[PDB]
Amino acid sequence: KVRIDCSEFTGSIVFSINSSYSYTPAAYYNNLSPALQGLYVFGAKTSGVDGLLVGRETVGSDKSYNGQTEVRECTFDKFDRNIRMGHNSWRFVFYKVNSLNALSPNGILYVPAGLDDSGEILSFYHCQFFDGAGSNIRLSCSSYTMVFNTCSFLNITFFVDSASSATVTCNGCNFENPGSASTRRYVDISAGHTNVFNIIGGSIVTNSNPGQTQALLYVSTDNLLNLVGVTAPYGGHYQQEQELGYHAFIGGAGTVTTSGVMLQLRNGAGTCPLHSSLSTFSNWNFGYGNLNA
Amino acid sequence: KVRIDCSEFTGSIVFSINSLSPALQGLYVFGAKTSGVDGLLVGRETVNGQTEVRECTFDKFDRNIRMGHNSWRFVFYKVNSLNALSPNGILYVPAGLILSFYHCQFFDGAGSNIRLSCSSYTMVFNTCSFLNITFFVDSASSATVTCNGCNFENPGSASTRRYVDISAGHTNVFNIIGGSIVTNSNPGQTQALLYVSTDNLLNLVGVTAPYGGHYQQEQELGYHAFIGGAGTVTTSGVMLQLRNGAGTCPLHSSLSTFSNWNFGYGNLNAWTVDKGTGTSSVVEYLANAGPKGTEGAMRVAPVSVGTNVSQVQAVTNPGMFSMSCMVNIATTPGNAGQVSIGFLDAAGNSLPGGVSANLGTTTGWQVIGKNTLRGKVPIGAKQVRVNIQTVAGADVKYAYLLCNVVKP
Amino acid sequence: YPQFSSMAKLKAFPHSEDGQLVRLLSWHEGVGLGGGLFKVSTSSTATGNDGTVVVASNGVRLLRVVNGPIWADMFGALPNSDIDSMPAVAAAYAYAASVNTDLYIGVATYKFKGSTPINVDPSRAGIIGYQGKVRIDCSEFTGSIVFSINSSLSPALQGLYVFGAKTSGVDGLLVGRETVNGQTEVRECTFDKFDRNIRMGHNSWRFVFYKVNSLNALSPNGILYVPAGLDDSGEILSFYHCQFFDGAGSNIRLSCSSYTMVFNTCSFLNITFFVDSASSATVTCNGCNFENPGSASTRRYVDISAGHTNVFNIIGGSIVTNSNPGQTQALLYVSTDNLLNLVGVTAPYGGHYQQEQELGYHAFIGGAGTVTTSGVMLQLRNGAGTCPLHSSLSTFSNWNFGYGNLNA
Amino acid sequence: GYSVEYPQFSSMAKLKAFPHSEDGQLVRLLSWHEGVGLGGGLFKVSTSSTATGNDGTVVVASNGVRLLRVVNGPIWADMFGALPNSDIDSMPAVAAAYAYAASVNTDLYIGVATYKFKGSTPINVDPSRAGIIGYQGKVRIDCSEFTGSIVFSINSSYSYTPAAYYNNLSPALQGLYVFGAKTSGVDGLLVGRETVGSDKSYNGQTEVRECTFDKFDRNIRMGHNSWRFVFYKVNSLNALSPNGILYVPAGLDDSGEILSFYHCQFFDGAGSNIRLSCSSYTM
């Protein structure tokens, strides 16, 4: 129950977490105690003031051994970027960490491209990511692997535009639009190649809005979206045909796979197919240029 | 940062845990790699609560962490284990005995590894990392290991050690879900980094299979693939690195798209042989003629006109594929021929997304298909057809025609 | 002094007082690097370079008051940052060459982006790390070559670890030019993860390589490539204590005719040395090691595969063969009309030798060329055994019954 | 004319004793030792820094405020208080300077002079991180009073990368005339390590250049992981041991690949010789 009011702080970052060692004793000590615990840290949405920097702003003379560092039971609120990955952002674990109401469009959680010695299993357990006023999560770094376990993504979009080899795994997470009338996507893998997004279990909740004019899940060419053990939602406000030209849940020219997915066959409003890549029938869109098949 | 120096401790084990605070928390416990001196024993050496070890590091013991007989449910959180003396020193579950690990790091063994040898034993790792160590599973029967969101890597290492080696027993299961498998370039990866033995299973879900130019697993297997062993491999939502400039390889024999791919039938069945007008062209099965000299091979020496050997099988979107071939050109006028992969719908119509690999003129056993025979399964595809074309006047042996379409 | 926090602020201000001294705190805002005193000149028409000559927005020149050496930070290079430093380093080198002084680069990591090569003119200036482990990250560079060395003395390049990301079509170092006296050296540099790490082009200068490392290239000729057609490059290419290793499929290929290369105390590890020049290529290796360390791979060490009158000399040094499943092919190959001379070196033997699979008989060297031996030693006390080297060294006539009879 | 560009301090002691209070302020150290005119430079005052003091590049004032040296180029020993031509043991200052230099992957330079090395603590050069370079090749190191097992060892801290990238980029030792007094048990240079480590040491491409080792027990001795070292213009002379000029003992691990010597002079006449006893060794 410690609250840190940073409304009058004008620095670039309030907290940074980075080891002073390249190997030992960091390989013995990082895991013994949390780096930050029990702190509710909030600002006043001042431009240029970030909450937490994970790693360092610039590449060090040597590597910084940050593996096994923990941020626990903390909230970062009303900063420009609440949590930002820097160099040497590897094997950090966030347990019961909340990020909310950030100023930047990437303010909830930002992983910029170009990071050195970063990307090994950035883990989040029981974390809450929330906004609704334009801030989102964006993963832009290549060869970056993140795991979210029992986390909540509320009124935000999870953007992945890494050039290559991003892997996001969500186990038991809930994606929801509570209170909001926004048509924003839940997950948007918009660029690069060999990017993988896994939705394993959890729930996808789609509360009614004026009309869902775009697909809530989007996977671009050469990327993969895997749905495992999850129920595909349906609502009468679903109007994804405005974007795609047809009534389907997922957009984009990437690939979707389905394992243990359920449909709401019991929904009075109806049910829709998930993605073009799951088409049962050949020449489904008459893309052959003829009527063959 | 509490530091427990056990370099002069001469006992069998330093700590034991036997019967909701954690049992241990906040301790760096290290030894001097003295033989017979173990760090942590979970349970007793001789034959219903939940207990936890958090925020501890075990280092430089014979066996850092060892499981014993105990009925309590154990959970590890932010535990490091590194640099042990015993070959099983990182973590050892002996035979004759759910164990859960969260954000634990098992690394820098310098010869020490993880070994699960206990039958009917279940282990779960979440957001853990296994670095410069091997994970052995030689349980007699029914061992289960599930790694969700974990990383297997060789950071800064030249070693060709395996990442996962399921080496014995039956009905042992190893699941890799999400996370990452990273293979930094080394002097040459001449053995498979994943191995699943007979009657055992390796399941890969939602993880990207890496590729690197240093991959040389054919030295062990006789053919270019990622996983060895006569067990079974399943894939669901697995991504292949189709745009990797060095190439891509199939994953396992158990995922072969085509029948009689290794000519283990003892014949050329399942392969459609079309000599064309070249009735004189010879297409024969040759025993003990492949790369290892212990496997079948198909020799094709066309005369006057080329010969095409093909096989078609069922496949459908969604899917990704990669194929490798073992080819030995004895002699050829020019380009010896071409291996090609095409897709068709159920009505036989050819579809876009076909790929081909030219055989060239170099003699001797060689891998074909690395950066050529790969891609995405086109939408609406219902059949996949491989065709092996050999030009007239060329004499070529073919072996291990391994294609994988990674999908459920 | 009047103070400006950044180059942008310095350029934007309307400087009007001739001779006035102003202080630049830093080239980039807040970094505290690249700053210094500048003198306003209203008469100067010198070309701006954003380093020693700054042209303000109003056209007034500011001339850097230099107290000491030129640093790339003075031209806007940002060490240990994700910003592209190549324009600043290129501009700094251009100034350095203009005053016939080497460009010193401080120890740090620099990112090279874009597609514009830097051409080092060794008759004017080299690029020298001062002093330590300087890293030049070219992973995002998309040009044909990062560095070229061409005039048409201090070393041209020294103390630099230059690496890419194995992007196809992006080469590391080109010595000479793409199209048709003087001596210059490349020393203490590492080239890593390019398509072709080092490629020879057209040039009349005698190049010497000292303590140069080349490894892990994408191209099959990626370690070191001497293409055919280099008629204008008549000088001997010399290498001293250079390491060519861990190619991950990349190799050395000499394809140019009438071309001579000399290697002294170099190591060729986990790579093949190819020579396929049409005629009159000469490679001499004195005190070199050819080995397959850590990977135990069966790939050939030396393959003189084509042409005529090509000579490969192995003088002293060592040929080491680590054990594998089976050495099913000869590690040394010399084709028809070519010559491999072995002098004062020990031929190795191992029980894994299975060269009869390729040759039909048990011998160390393959090919229909010629092998000579002077002062060569055999491992006569090797318990696994010993084998003959080559057919061309046959003691007895009609040894293979190639006469078509039993004569002799 | 009594104005100065930056606040000036005549010695390291005065710099540390002053109560620095203005964050970011640039101050000038005229010299490490008062009046000597060596080791000076510009320092940036930092009140936020928690970096460990080393009395060279990171200075901690008496009030705890850090002063950070503005360094352009290699590290010099006189930045850490090393004094030319002195009777005081210079090995602690050079060891401290090298420790920082290696920590930032930068070579250590030593100014032209004669230095005395006393005590018994060897300097272990990590060729993957930093070398020790005598300025203009005219550095003399008097080890007559050194009682340790070896003056210098050269061994990498890595088993593979980045040693495969860095070892070649600069010499491990250059421009040093190192001599002892033939006291038994004191060796000059150890190439590799004394004992087999848990992992191998990637020492390939490491260079000793323009150095002389003289009047030691064994001047140059090969240890474990002694592979692909190159010695250029290195001289070994007047050693005590019968194998003192250059000794390769038997039993060495991960050793023997192309140990190379260019323009080296091996001379004695008083009983010391070269002996290669290790198997599978190529020189």
Residue numbers in the entry:
A (entry chain A): 148 to 440
B (entry chain B): 148 to 166, 179 to 206, 213 to 262, 268 to 578
C (entry chain D): 16 to 167, 179 to 206, 213 to 440
D (entry chain C): 11 to 293
Paper text:
Here, we describe a phage tailspike protein, named K2-2, that specifically depolymerizes the K2 capsular polysaccharide (CPS) of K. pneumoniae into tetrasaccharide repeating units. During the initial stage of infection, the tailspike proteins (TSPs) of bacteriophage recognize specific polysaccharides on the surface of the host cell and attach to them for adsorption. TSPs, also known as polysaccharide depolymerases, have the function of binding and digesting CPS. TSPs typically consist of three domains: an N-terminal particle-binding domain that connects to the tail structure or baseplate of the phage, a receptor-binding domain that extends from the homotrimeric structure and is responsible for host recognition and catalytic activity, and a C-terminal domain that plays a vital role in trimer formation, receptor binding, and intra-molecular chaperone functions.
Before the trimeric wild-type structures were determined using the N-terminally His-tagged protein, the first crystals of K2-2 were, indeed, obtained by using a C-terminally His-tagged protein (termed K2-2C-His). The structure was solved at 2.17 Å resolution by the MAD phasing method under the space group of P63. Unexpectedly, the solved structure revealed four protomers of the enzyme in an asymmetric unit, which formed a tetramer without the presence of a trimer. Specifically, two subunits are assembled into a dimer of a parallel left-handed helix, and two such dimers combine to form a right-handed superhelix. The two dimers superimpose well with each other, and also with any two adjacent subunits in the trimeric wild-type structure, presumably sharing a common interface. The intersubunit carbohydrate-binding groove could be overlaid well with that of the trimeric structure (Cα rmsd = 0.29 Å), including the residues involved in binding the sugar. Notably, as determined by top agar assay, this tetrameric form of K2-2C-His possessed a significant capsule degradation activity towards the K2 K. pneumoniae. Conceivably, although the electron density corresponding to the C-terminal His-tag was not visible in all subunits, the protruding His-tag might give rise to steric hindrance that interfered with the assembly of the enzyme into a trimer. Finally, the structural and functional characterization of the tetrameric form of K2-2 here demonstrates, for the first time in the field of TPSs, that a functional intersubunit catalytic center could be formed without the need for trimerization.
